[PDB]
């Protein structure tokens, strides 16, 4: 039956475990340590009223967007520390924002359950809302741009959806999850994406067929943030169980855990470096931590915030790392 | 070049105008008091919404209610269209002034669910700061449903039998002592959860609220006064 099929899947997982002789840090113990990685607030973009809850970088790796529950959507400039736009919002409760690779449009996923899409470079030069993507019943946790026209949107009604803007309807629906789908990251090759939910599981979906290609259930609690490994065969999950984990597609098995007994708070955000040695985790014990990805050792601390770290974003080239928090202060780090 | 200087001057003008707009909105955001409304459906959220509408706006999903009393404006958020699980969107309501919590008085079976809801509110890591106003709604129908009889509280709550009335404000329940013992048991049962733990950084403000209670927005007002004043009295020692 289904239980016998689950036993068969446990057998295949045990076969992959027999393929898994030693740990990755055990395998890469011939490779020496990364070393200490200090960092400092190279700029401090201040100017929010309420808690900054999510940010997104640009593909220029120069301009970025941050969103807070006051009702402001602020495009910061990292280099000059000047705010390019600050869109006033219809509803204050905003749980994410996203920034088009073309740079023209900014998305605003909110708890009003309507996604909003805004055009920055308008002909008139005055910024208004382009369209209102409305097909969800739960709050909108995360959203990312597939292309300039296609957008992937997770929500709290346990379904992801892929959307086209001028059409105005859900092109594809992603309904496999039971818990609230709360994080997503999309691959560089862009035809496949991943999503973790509150049911301690990640599904990876082909964006054309819209079905769960693979399911991973390593975690023990809610999963707050997820991020692809850069070269595309793996991804990391940051989850409320105070553990972080690196998961692989090709082996179909988890590889690495990232845990220390003294830290107990849940991971809120996660990001990678460009090379992928250097994993970055926001936290509720007020300090971002940064891990060697291939030894699972705490390389360092990036502590400058007074409250919980909501959002964490690495540039494409990989120099700057922006971070926000509920102290309303956004800071750019090395 | 000179064009780079022109771009820098344009960026300076844009950041100055944007900071001016944000500085103008800072005062109106700081002045207006935000109020989460939470509760069960049979507990009359909608009727007290109608009472503040005695005293456009996006009705999609969340409902909003505006009311001002004594030159102070309260903007009060009802989480309507959202799905039933609340472990994650209740984190979004951190910086709010006070969590109004509404309980149906009359029917004793869902009171245990409301008590577990209150205990979950009180011990949450992000909701430990916020003072919780408490409302006990449809107070008359409680009195009718106990004075009609044949409906034992004792079956649901066994500690009612080993309970007596501590103190009261007598003329309103002066028709009956046993309804007084009932409703004051309900107050006491919430306050066991309220005074269970903490360091006195957030407080429970119970009110015995009928269907027809007009001025109860001002009771909301005065106990917002108590919460903000206690916040400031802690703010003296904190800085």
């Amino acid at each position: 039956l289904r239980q016998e099929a689950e036993q068969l899947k446990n057998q295949i997982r045990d076969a992959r475990k027999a393929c898994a002789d030693a740990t990755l840090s055990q395998i890469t113990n011939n490779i020496d340590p990364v070393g200490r990685i200090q960092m400092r607030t190279r700029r401090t973009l201040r100017g929010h009223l309420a808690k900054i809850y999510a940010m997104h970088w640009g593909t220029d790796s120069r301009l970025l967007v941050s969103a807070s529950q006051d009702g402001k959507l602020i495009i910061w400039d990292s280099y000059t520390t000047n705010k390019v736009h600050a869109i006033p919002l219809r509803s204050s409760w905003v749980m994410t924002c996203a920034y088009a690779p073309s740079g023209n449009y900014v998305a605003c996923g909110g708890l009003d359950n309507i996604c909003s899409i805004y055009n920055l470079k308008t002909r008139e030069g005055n910024v208004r809302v382009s369209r209102e993507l409305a097909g969800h019943t739960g709050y909108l946790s995360c959203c990312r741009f597939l292309d300039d026209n296609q957008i992937v949107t997770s929500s709290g009604d346990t379904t992801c959806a892929l959307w086209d803007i001028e059409t105005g309807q859900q092109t594809t629906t992603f309904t496999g999850h039971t818990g609230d789908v709360m994080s997503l990251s999309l691959a560089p090759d862009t035809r496949l994406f991943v999503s973790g939910a509150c049911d301690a599981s990640a599904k990876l979906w082909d964006v054309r067929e819209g079905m769960c290609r693979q399911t991973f259930t390593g975690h023990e609690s809610d999963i707050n943030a997820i991020c692809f490994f850069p070269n595309g065969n793996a991804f990391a999950t940051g989850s409320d169980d105070a553990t972080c984990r690196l998961f692989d597609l090709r082996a179909d098995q988890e590889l690495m855990t990232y845990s220390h007994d003294n830290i107990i708070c849940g991971i809120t955000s996660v990001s990678f470096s460009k090379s992928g040695r250097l994993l970055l985790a926001g936290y509720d014990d007020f300090n971002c931590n940064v891990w060697d990805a291939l030894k699972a050792d705490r390389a360092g601390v990036l502590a400058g915030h007074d409250n919980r770290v909501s959002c964490l974003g690495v540039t494409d080239d990989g120099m700057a790392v922006a971070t926000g928090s509920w102290d309303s202060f956004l800071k750019i780090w090395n | 070049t000179e064009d780079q200087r022109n771009e820098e001057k344009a960026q300076r003008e844009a950041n100055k105008k944007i900071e001016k707009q944000l500085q103008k909105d800072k005062q109106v955001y700081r002045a207006t008091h935000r109020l989460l409304l939470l509760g069960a459906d049979n507990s009359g959220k909608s009727t007290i919404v109608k009472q503040m509408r005695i005293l456009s706006g996006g009705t999609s999903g969340i409902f909003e209610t505006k009311f001002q009393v004594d030159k102070v404006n309260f903007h009060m958020f009802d989480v309507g269209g959202q799905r039933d699980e609340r472990r994650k969107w209740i984190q979004c309501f951190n910086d709010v002034t006070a969590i109004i919590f509404v309980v149906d008085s009359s029917d004793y079976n869902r009171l245990q669910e409301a008590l577990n809801l209150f205990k979950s509110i009180w011990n949450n890591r992000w909701l430990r700061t916020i003072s919780v106003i408490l409302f006990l709604n449809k107070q008359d129908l409680l009195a009718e449903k106990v004075l009609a009889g044949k409906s034992k509280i004792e079956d649901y709550f066994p500690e009612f039998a080993r309970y007596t009335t501590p103190e009261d404000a007598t003329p309103e329940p002066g028709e009956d002592p046993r309804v007084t013992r009932a409703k004051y048991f309900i107050r006491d049962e919430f306050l066991r959860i309220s005074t269970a733990s903490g360091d006195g950084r957030h407080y429970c403000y119970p009110h015995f609220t009928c269907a027809v209670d007009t001025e109860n927005a001002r009771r909301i007002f005065n106990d917002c006064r108590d919460s903000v004043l206690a916040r400031y009295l802690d703010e003296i020692n904190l800085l």
Partner: nanobody
Amino acid sequence: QVQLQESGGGLVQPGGSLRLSCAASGFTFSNYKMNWVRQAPGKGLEWVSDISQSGASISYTGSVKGRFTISRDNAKNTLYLQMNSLKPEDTAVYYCARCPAPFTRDCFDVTSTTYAYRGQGTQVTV
């Protein structure tokens, strides 16, 4: 992989005393706090029993307060709910509910129909 199976339960004589177990795997059992939640037919879900991560502190719903008992064996990694002096309306489906967060006093376990950390449940009959 998180794992919850109940054991025990079924039909018994109406005055009888019935012992149930909940096995939990895929996490440290020590830090989470356990609940039992019962579903009578034609009803909503209801929280019945609560016990902390330690097991020193404990809480019961009002109906079955003096009647039933709950125990945890963290080293043995098991949960138990024993019913004593059974009453005929208490027949229900007895889910084992795991609290979402660790090191956390509050939970939001009893929900509409769906929840990640409930067990599949067993049905008891008077």
